[PDB]
Amino acid sequence: DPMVSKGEELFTGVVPILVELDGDVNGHKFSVSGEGEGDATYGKLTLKFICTTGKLPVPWPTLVTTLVLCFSRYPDHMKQHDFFKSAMPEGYVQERTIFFKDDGNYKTRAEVKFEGDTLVNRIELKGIDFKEDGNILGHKLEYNYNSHNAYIMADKQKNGIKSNFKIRHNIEDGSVQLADHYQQNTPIGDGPVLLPDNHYLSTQNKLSKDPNEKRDHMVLLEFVTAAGIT
């Protein structure tokens, strides 16, 4: 399939990744820069993110989903359903609203595309209605992540995909802060894309620290794999 080959060609080996985010949460402005690489053959991502403006005013785990689904591993039998690679190299827009239960919300707009050989994710994030000593602005979330599955559906009105899914962040008292995600992706170019049958993505994230790094930062190892529906 020449369309599948096009995506293969772009993602069959290790691809460098750059991530740049500008954020404002309740008027707390911040920027994050990330660098690393992805190997879609294994659904595998490894990046280091740095808050370049000082202290990050929200917990790092709450930014993981915002901070490149083209690196997901679509099994061979599902390659006709990989919208994310099919939109490349021109890329796609990824938009979300993330509702933190009993707290504020993030709204994000990102463009994911190739700049030469490098896959780039440029993000604007706006957060409002947060409680200034709630779990987010009060930094009450553990530095870890629970694995999760998210259903993906075609969004025919936008020539793309949509997804709503739940993330549960662990609170330092043992409870859980729900983050209900609503997501839409639409292609940037005019070319054809692969619109998928319903399926899901299964994700495992490992968060760590660089022992020699004094800036506020996050090291991330992520695996995302497509599956279903059966």
Angle at 96 between CA 200 and CA 112, to 5 degrees: 80
Tokens linked to 51:
């808050």
> Could you tell me which of 6, 4, 54, 16 has the C-alpha nearest to residue 32?
54
> What tokens does 78 get?
């599902």
HSE-CB for 4 with a 13 A CA cutoff: 10
Give the experimental resolution in Å: 1.3
69 neighbors 196 (Cβ within 8 angstroms)? no
Residues forming beta bridges with residue 207, ordered by sequence position: 220
CB atoms within 10 A of CB 93: 17
N residues, the chain: 230
Question: Are 25 and 106 a contacting pair, CB within 8 Å?
Answer: yes
In the chain, residues preceding a discontinuity (C to N beyond 2.5 A) are 67
Number of H helices, E strands in the chain: 2, 11
| Beta carbons within 10 angstroms of residue 115's beta carbon | 11
Q: What is the CA radius of gyration of the chain?
A: 17
User: In b/e form, how buried is each residue of 146-164, taking b as 16+ CB within 10 angstroms?
Assistant: eebebebebbeeebbbbbe
- Do the Cβ atoms of 135 and 167 come closer than 8 Å? no
Rounded CA-CA distance 29/127 in Å is 10
Structural domains in the chain plus CATH codes: 2-227 (2.40.155.10)
Residue pair 123/66 in contact (Cβ under 8 Å)? The answer is: yes
Exp. method: X-ray
